[PDB]
Design a protein around this nucleic acid. Structure first.
Ligand SMILES: [Zn+2]
Ligand SMILES: [Zn+2]
Ligand SMILES: [Zn+2]
Ligand SMILES: [Zn+2]
Ligand SMILES: [Zn+2]
Lengths: 284, 460, 66, 344, 351
DNA sequence: CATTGATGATGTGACATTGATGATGTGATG
DNA sequence: CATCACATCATCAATGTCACATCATCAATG
């Protein structure tokens, strides 16, 4: 059962800047690259030549890291070439970093990279009808702050959720960041069947790597290792911002709101609601 | 099957660690492992602390501890670990030679034999000397199975085949027909035949100039990568070099002539480990080059051909004349009674025709497989997947031809109690060593597996 | 290890009985019997066993195709 | 059997082809006929020869023939030589025949226009859902000592007689009464057949019969469910108004030739309009297993599937011994039955 | 050479919570030999297909199923929020066989009776499946049509190889005049596509009716394993969900509460609806020689697009169907799969 | 108890078979 | 080497061998 390893490791020199900034400057994410390179060699060994891939998110975009986009136009001899290719790629992307790169700090291109990974996976799986891969992915984040909960990218994150679920794809996660449970990714792995890795920085991750993210490719009979509970009291009222439990859900807009509603024209969609219906709501 | 893994375990412990000396051998032997074991290995390789069994006991949830014991019993069988009743527990730890060699291979080990080849200008294209390798391999197939000329000049190769009594004809008079070993050779396609003969080469040279671990390292380097430059030049012991030279004589070395070069890595040894799509003057016509016709008509309908494969077909069938894209042949009760004269069970042949000659029965197996697996419980009756009328008349014929059915093995004895007989009887319902038995007689005529696992449990 | 080398033939007890008939005929080359469904034989005679098996069984049957 | 439902009035076609002494030469209308004095050269009457010469005298603008194959053509060649006609018609029965001489009667009458097609007349509404079967009636050593005692065809019923065969067929009978299906049983034997017919004891069919009771059992077969088993003797062929088949049991297995069996089956599986069962037409071949007729039953199923109809074997009878009237189930009573069949 | 929806109007409000009722005809008409197995069993097949399709794509809606036989119409499924009830109902049907003819009026009236307890936010649509050439009514037809479309229920019908303009007139009535719903077919591929578009929520130019809020809450998964106990089937429930206020246990289902009767989903279903809220601008095939972009795919990596002038072949389809608002590429399979499964325009989501 | 008729009886036609006897191949030979 | 002579093989045709075919006889029917 050959399987595909699609590791998603973000590299924001902002997130990496936090990575060094948290704790000491005793070891850069270079260690993370190393542990990942070793782990990729491991997964490649694991099966009889089972394919893999990796992409990462710039401050201003993304690029296929393993695949070696059309550019011309040791150990097994092949772990060498894959990793070395990768190293040239990542450093050359490190040329793609400067003040203009230090400008594009509006969004987080995690979701788009995730989707494109799913897309290329499907491009194989639909292209690879013969030798059907039983594939899955991994997420990596040198976690940081300065944007407590970026909510903009949450929707297509859910869309990727369903994309994998229908595509029947395990998706495990390793966030390496401050003591913040990424409920987005938390419930993502939760439903879409991954394993939650909220870790600290300087530990040699190799152990967690080889342990927690070898389950799926064909197996999944083992006790999963999630974090503590995965409550589904979901995103807050769009107006209030405090996490909401008993739904006050607006309309075809589906703006999720609190006991607030302005009596009309929910503060996401310009669409009125019968004020007598508002009396029916406040009949509580 | 003798199950090359079992031969690996067969050698005693000290020589097994003699072979863990090569991390390349470490990985190669890791790759045959059960994924149960493979994963558990990878778990243990680096937590530098031996471990009790119960952790892996709790690793498996419900049904699947069967393969858990598969993993542990097999790993015990080749002793890659050392079980340890240290504190009365099972303090599991690998052979630290095995684990350390593999670990070095994980991060650039010192196994230069794993990379004894050299990156030089290898002039070998895919078709480059390749079609020559396919020609020689087909030549051995024809000569051993019986070619119009059995042109095998491998007096060494013929000696390796005969010394094990592989192919059976009047050998003193020169007859070498497909014996029981020869019929099975008609059966083990590539991995089957390639492995039977890799072990035949093992047997031919096993005492004198053995260099057993070194020869094994040569075998695994062959199975590993195209030796390319400097392989035969440098990366081999003189004994391993002679083994590689014979392998080239056996085709298994895809190097040029003249006895001076790096190791030319022919696809034979790559596939020997890989077990994938098996296709190897200046012509070659695939993929559908394999030809046959086998449907529920009980008849041959062939357009493509492979004169080796056509010889195989003619084996279990009658023939009258060769034609454009078909040969004169209809499969019957008599046609397979032929193979049954060689005793050749038409039990290989069922899944063989489910393996062979589908290169011309692609629509046949796509119409009659129908992907009737999700539909297997939906629409209950399977849709001729695979064709069971064919198996029915074949099987039926065997039963008919099973009037004086014979059994293999020998009649075991010294059974005293129903405790270990209940035990050994159910465990032979479990490992499948039993055909028939009875405590009442304390008798059964089977192979020695039950005996093997009870003999091993009782003594060590 | 404990066993006795042989060629274990199994069939319905009638067929075993006929086999042993022809065997008693052929100087009785069944090394031992285990029961009505089991016999112990030597492959230095069982093929000739099939020989006379076919001989007498066809002399009886003769298969007219009719 | 047909022509009076059909559009003729019986007053004109005189059946003294060779049969009677009938109205030769006064048939205002056509004549229905055979080959039995036309030239079966035993013309002893001369009214016989008179119908011959009368066939000569009037120029028969058309001639309708049926299965002349068994007849030597020579006689028919002489008769058509006598008629001075100018056209004919030949309705063939088998594909390659004995009147296929240097003159095939084809070019004598005319070209082939249509050919038979079973696969086209037994999978829609005419003879759809057709399935064959060959039960292997459990052997018992008495049959094997009969095999041992002799090599003579006398052994035929000696294996046919199997009481387990009666039990399988009796489950089929209780089943098709339970299914409302119709059961055809073929048996060329007389003795063991009447023993079973007593053993089952419904209004049953046998040889040697005067026949208004066969009309009774045909209707009360196509008309009554209390009686749901008929045994078809070789007296059935030829020819009868062949019963349609919902459950055909065949016991006698020589029936030489192979094409004899062919016509027999293409007649027995008559156009049957019942579709309640997923396989409305069951063909059964009760053959005692481990016997002389194993080869013949294998050849039977071989020729079966040679020509299209679905075939199977269910040798796992649901309560094979739970069936009532377990008559002669004892190997021993089986032995007495074989004694009697030796006597029959 | 394109056959493409020029204007994909979707940025508005479609019918989301649809009380869908497929109706079936199991008559001697569905037997007839024009389809490969038959009309009948093939219809059962594609109906099962639609059960899965719908309850996937509309995983917050409800359904009941009705068949028609022997001048009579027969429901086969109570309003059910578990797919398998419909699935096994369809199984139990396929083995039963068709007879007689459709009493269209009775089916319409049974459906009319059914969808009454559906509130406003819950919308009402029936789904005819027709293959007959006539009906059998016991009640005045346009009478009941008046009642139906007077109670705000559009219907989509799928007739077989004919046309019956009463169907078109009744639909046009139910569909506020404008008609597209009398889709009949000429091929089986055609058939399944008909299904797949029947799945999606259906707008035309909405009558601006009441936009009502919907209130609910969310349950929570259980912890104890042995504690098996249920209140929705009264069976053993080794762990499941817990009404946000009524705090009863519920075996896995997106259903409404069975104690205080409120809806219970997580969030995922809302997200599917959003995927049906703002679908994207269609990937325009870049102009042949005027495109001259990078020579691969962006979403995937597909280096093929042209052979650079083979007179005819390369000058055919310079296939770089790239997005509109993002203008970022994606190959033909990428376009098909993006627009099909994960609309999820990364190039447009990217910035 | 006359009658008519269904069904066995034995006469007779037609071809398979086996065999007696010519035919021509071949050895001996002057 | 040309010749005749035995020597197995070919071919008409009796033999018998069975099979349809009208005639005889018990026995129900009215
Ligand atoms: Zn809103
Ligand atoms: Zn419940
Ligand atoms: Zn509640
Ligand atoms: Zn693409
Ligand atoms: Zn876009």
């Amino acid at each position: 059962s050959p399987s595909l390893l699609t590791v998603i490791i973000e590299i924001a020199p902002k997130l990496w800047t936090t990575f060094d900034e948290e704790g000491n400057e005793k070891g850069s994410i270079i260690k993370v690259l190393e542990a990942l390179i070793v782990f990729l060699n491991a997964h490649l060994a694991f099966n009889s030549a089972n394919k893999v891939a990796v992409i990462a998110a710039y401050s201003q975009g993304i690029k296929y890291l393993y695949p070696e986009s059309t550019s011309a136009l040791x150990x097994y001899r092949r772990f060498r070439n894959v990793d070395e290719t990768l190293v040239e790629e990542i450093y050359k992307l490190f040329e793609l970093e400067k003040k203009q790169i230090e400008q594009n700090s509006q969004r987080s291109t995690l979701a788009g990279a995730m989707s494109a990974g799913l897309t290329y996976v499907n491009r194989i799986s639909k292209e690879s009808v013969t030798t059907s891969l039983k594939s899955r992915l991994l997420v990596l984040t040198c976690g940081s702050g300065s944007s407590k909960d970026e909510i903009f990218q949450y929707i297509p994150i859910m869309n990727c959720i369903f994309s994998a679920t229908k595509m029947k794809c395990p998706i495990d996660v390793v966030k390496i960041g401050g003591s913040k449970e990424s409920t987005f990714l938390q419930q993502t792995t939760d439903a879409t069947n991954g394993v939650y890795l909220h870790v600290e920085s300087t530990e040699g991750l190799i152990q967690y790597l080889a342990t927690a993210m070898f389950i799926d490719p064909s197996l999944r009979p083992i006790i999963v290792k999630p974090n503590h509970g995965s409550v589904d009291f979901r995103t807050s009222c769009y107006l209030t911002g405090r996490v909401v439990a008993v739904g006050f859900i607006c309309s075809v807009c589906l703006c999720v709101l609190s006991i607030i509603p302005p009596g009309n024209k929910c503060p996401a969609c310009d669409s009125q609601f019968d004020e007598h219906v508002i009396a029916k709501l406040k009949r509580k | 099957k003798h199950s090359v893994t079992q031969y690996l375990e067969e050698i005693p412990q000290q020589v097994q660690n003699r072979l863990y000396t090569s991390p390349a051998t470490c990985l190669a032997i890791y790759r045959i492992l059960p994924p149960l074991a493979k994963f558990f290995i990878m778990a243990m390789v680096f937590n530098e602390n031996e471990v009790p069994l119960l952790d892996l006991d709790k690793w498996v949830n419900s049904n699947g501890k069967l393969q858990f014991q598969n993993a542990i019993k097999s790993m015990k069988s080749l002793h890659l670990l050392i079980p340890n009743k240290s504190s009365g527990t099972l303090m599991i730890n690998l052979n630290p030679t095995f684990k350390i060699s593999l670990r070095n291979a994980l991060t650039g080990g010192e196994v230069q034999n794993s990379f004894g080849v050299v990156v030089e200008e290898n002039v070998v294209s895919l078709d480059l000397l390749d079609e020559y390798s396919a020609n020689k391999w087909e030549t051995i197939l024809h000569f051993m199975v019986g070619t119009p000329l059995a042109k095998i000049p491998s007096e060494k190769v013929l000696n390796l085949l005969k010394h094990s009594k592989l192919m059976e004809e009047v050998n003193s008079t020169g007859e070498f027909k497909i014996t029981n070993e020869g019929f099975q050779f008609l059966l083990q396609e590539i991995n089957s035949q390639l492995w039977t003969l890799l072990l035949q080469y093992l047997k031919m040279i096993e005492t004198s100039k053995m260099d057993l671990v070194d020869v094994l390292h040569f075998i695994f380097m062959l199975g590993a990568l195209e030796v390319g430059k400097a392989y035969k030049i440098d990366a081999l012991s003189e004994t391993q070099r002679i083994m590689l030279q014979d392998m080239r004589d056996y085709g298994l070395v895809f190097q040029k002539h003249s006895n001076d070069s790096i190791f030319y890595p022919t696809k034979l040894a790559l596939m020997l480990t890989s077990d994938t799509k098996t296709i190897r003057g200046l012509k070659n016509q695939d993929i559908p080059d394999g030809s046959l016709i086998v449907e529920t008509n009980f008849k041959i309908y062939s357009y493509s051909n492979s004169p080796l494969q056509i010889a195989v077909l003619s084996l279990f069938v009658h023939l009258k004349a060769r034609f454009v894209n078909m040969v004169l042949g209809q499969i019957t009760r008599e046609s397979i009674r032929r193979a049954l004269t060689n005793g050749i069970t038409a039990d290989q042949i069922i899944a063989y025709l489910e393996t062979h000659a589908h290169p011309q029965m692609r629509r046949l197996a796509e119409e009659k497989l129908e992907k009737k697996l999700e539909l297997d419980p939906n629409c209950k009756e399977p849709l001729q997947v695979l064709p069971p009328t064919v198996v029915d008349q074949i099987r039926l014929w065997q039963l008919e031809l099973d009037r004086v059915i014979t059994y293999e093995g020998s009649l075991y004895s010294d059974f005293e109690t129903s405790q270990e007989y209940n035990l050994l009887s159910k465990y032979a319902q479990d490992i499948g060593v039993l055909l028939w038995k009875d405590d009442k007689k304390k008798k059964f005529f089977i192979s020695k597996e039950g005996n093997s696992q009870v003999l091993d449990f009782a003594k060590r | 290890a404990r066993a006795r080398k042989g060629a274990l033939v199994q069939c319905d007890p009638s067929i075993k009985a006929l086999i042993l008939q022809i065997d008693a005929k052929m100087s009785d080359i069944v090394l031992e019997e285990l029961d009505d469904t089991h016999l112990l034989v030597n492959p230095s005679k069982v093929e000739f066993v099939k020989h006379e098996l076919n001989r007498l069984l066809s002399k009886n049957i003769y298969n007219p195709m009719d | 059997q047909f022509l009076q439902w059909c559009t003729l009035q019986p007053e004109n076609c005189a059946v003294f082809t060779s049969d009677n002494k009938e109205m030769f030469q006064t048939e205002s209308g056509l004549v229905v006929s055979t080959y039995s004095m036309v030239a079966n050269t035993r013309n002893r009457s001369h009214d016989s020869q008179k119908v011959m010469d009368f066939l000569t005298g009037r120029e028969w603008g058309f001639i309708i023939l049926d299965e002349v194959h068994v007849v030597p053509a020579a006689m028919f060649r002489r008769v058509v030589s006598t008629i001075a006609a100018h056209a004919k018609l030949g309705l063939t029965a088998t594909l390659v025949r004995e009147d296929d001489k240097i003159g095939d009667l084809n070019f004598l009458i005319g070209p082939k226009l249509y050919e038979a097609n079973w696969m086209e007349l037994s999978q829609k509404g005419h003879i759809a859902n057709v399935q064959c079967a060959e039960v292997w009636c459990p052997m018992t050593a008495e049959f094997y000592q009969e095999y041992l005692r002799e090599t003579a065809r006398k052994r035929m019923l000696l294996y046919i007689m199997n009481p387990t065969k009666f039990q399988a067929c009796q489950f089929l009978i209780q089943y098709h009464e339970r299914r409302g299906d119709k059961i055809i049983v073929f048996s060329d034997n007389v003795y063991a057949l009447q023993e079973y017919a007593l053993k089952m004891g419904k209004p049953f069919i046998y040889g040697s019969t005067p026949q208004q009771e066969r009309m009774n059992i045909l209707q009360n077969f196509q008309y009554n469910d209390q009686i749901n088993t008929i045994f078809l003797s070789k007296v059935g062929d030829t020819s009868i108004d062949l019963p349609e088949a919902t459950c055909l049991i065949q016991i006698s297995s020589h029936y030489g030739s192979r094409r004899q069996e062919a016509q027999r089956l293409g007649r027995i599986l008559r156009a049957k309009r019942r579709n309640d069962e997923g396989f409305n037409a069951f063909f059964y071949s009760l053959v005692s297993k481990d016997t002389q007729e194993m080869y013949y039953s294998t050849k039977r199923q071989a020729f079966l599937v040679d020509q299209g109809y679905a075939f199977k074997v269910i040798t796992h009878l649901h309560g094979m011994e739970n069936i009532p009237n377990l008559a002669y189930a004892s190997p021993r009573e089986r032995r007495e039955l074989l004694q009697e069949v030796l006597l029959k | 050479k394109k056959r493409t929806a020029k204007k994909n109007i979707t940025p508005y409000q479609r019918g989301i919570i649809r009380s869908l009722i497929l109706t079936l005809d199991c008559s001697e008409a569905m037997l007839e030999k024009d389809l490969r197995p038959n009309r009948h069993a093939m219809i059962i097949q594609y109906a099962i297909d639609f059960v899965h399709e719908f309850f996937d794509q509309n995983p917050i809606s409800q359904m009941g199923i009705i068949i028609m036989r022997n001048g009579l119409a027969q429901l086969v499924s109570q309003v059910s929020g578990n797919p398998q009830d419909h699935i096994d109902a369809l199984k139990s049907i396929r083995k039963q066989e068709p007879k007689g003819n459709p009493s269209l009026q009775n089916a319409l009236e049974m459906a009319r009776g059914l969808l009454l307890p559906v509130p406003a936010h819950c919308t009402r649509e029936v789904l005819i499946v027709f293959g007959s050439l006539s009906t059998t009514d016991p009640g005045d037809i346009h009478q009941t049509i008046d009642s139906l479309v007077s109670e705000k229920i559009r219907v989509k019908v799928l007739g077989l190889s004919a046309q019956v303009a009463i169907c078109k007139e009744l639909c046009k009535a139910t569909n506020y005049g404008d008609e597209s719903f009398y889709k009949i077919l000429l091929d089986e591929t055609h058939l399944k596509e008909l299904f797949n578009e029947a799945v999606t929520p259906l707008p035309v130019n909405k009558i601006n009716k009441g936009f009502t809020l919907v209130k609910m809450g969310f349950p929570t998964r259980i912890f104890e394993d042995t504690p098996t106990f249920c209140s929705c089937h009264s069976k053993l429930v080794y762990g499941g969900y817990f009404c946000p206020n009524c705090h009863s246990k519920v075996c896995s289902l997106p259903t409404v509460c069975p104690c205080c009767d409120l809806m219970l989903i997580l969030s995922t279903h809302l997200a599917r609806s959003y995927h049906h809220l703002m679908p994207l601008k269609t990937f325009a095939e870049v102009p042949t020689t005027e495109k001259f972009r990078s020579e691969d795919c962006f979403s995937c990596q597909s280096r093929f697009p042209x052979x650079x002038x083979x007179x005819x072949x390369x000058x055919x389809x310079x296939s770089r169907y790239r997005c509109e608002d993002c203008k970022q590429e994606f190959c033909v399979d990428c376009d098909v799969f993006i627009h099909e499964i994960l609309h999820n325009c990364p190039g447009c989501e990217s910035k």
